[PDB]
Amino acid sequence: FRTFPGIPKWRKTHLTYRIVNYTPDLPKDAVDSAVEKALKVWEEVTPLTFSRLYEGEADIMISFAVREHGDFYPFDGPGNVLAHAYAPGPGINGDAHFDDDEQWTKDTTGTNLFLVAAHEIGHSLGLFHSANALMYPLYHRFRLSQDDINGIQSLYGPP
């Protein structure tokens, strides 16, 4: 596994997230479900607890965007970069963005929102790309790998 420059991690254990807007590709509940299930992947094997916000600035702001959308990393249309997220910190740090030029699906016919979001929340919590693994930079009975478990635990520990 790998972490970010200067080993950044959330200094607290109670983290807030807000789903800022929604993809047209799914019903809102499917997006909510994939996000919650993405958070649980990490919440279950750490002391971290996630709460949802509907107003104001949450630590992890979750949004769908296309092309240029207010940061230094514009999206690139269909394919290539499906999503990205930021290391722990204030402001844009911790936030996760999803390219809405991808076809976000509940299943595997398009791009699975849950699977990318899980990988993205890994970035929101201080994990970078592995060398093996959910944090491996490639979208390909699902279980969080030992290499992934080792990563988040060498940072926050177990529950």
Ligand SMILES: COc1ccc(S(=O)(=O)N(CC(=O)NO)Cc2ccncc2)cc1
């Ligand atoms: C299911 O977990 C994912 C989630 C997203 C991606 S990605 O969007 O296709 N990835 C960007 C990425 O890692 N964002 O966090 C592309 C990339 C291209 C070149 N260098 C590094 C990465 C892949 C697997």
Ligand SMILES: [Ca+2]
């Ligand atoms: Ca943030």
Ligand SMILES: [Ca+2]
């Ligand atoms: Ca793209």
Ligand SMILES: [Ca+2]
């Ligand atoms: Ca889309």
Ligand SMILES: [Zn+2]
């Ligand atoms: Zn972005």
Ligand SMILES: [Zn+2]
């Ligand atoms: Zn990534």
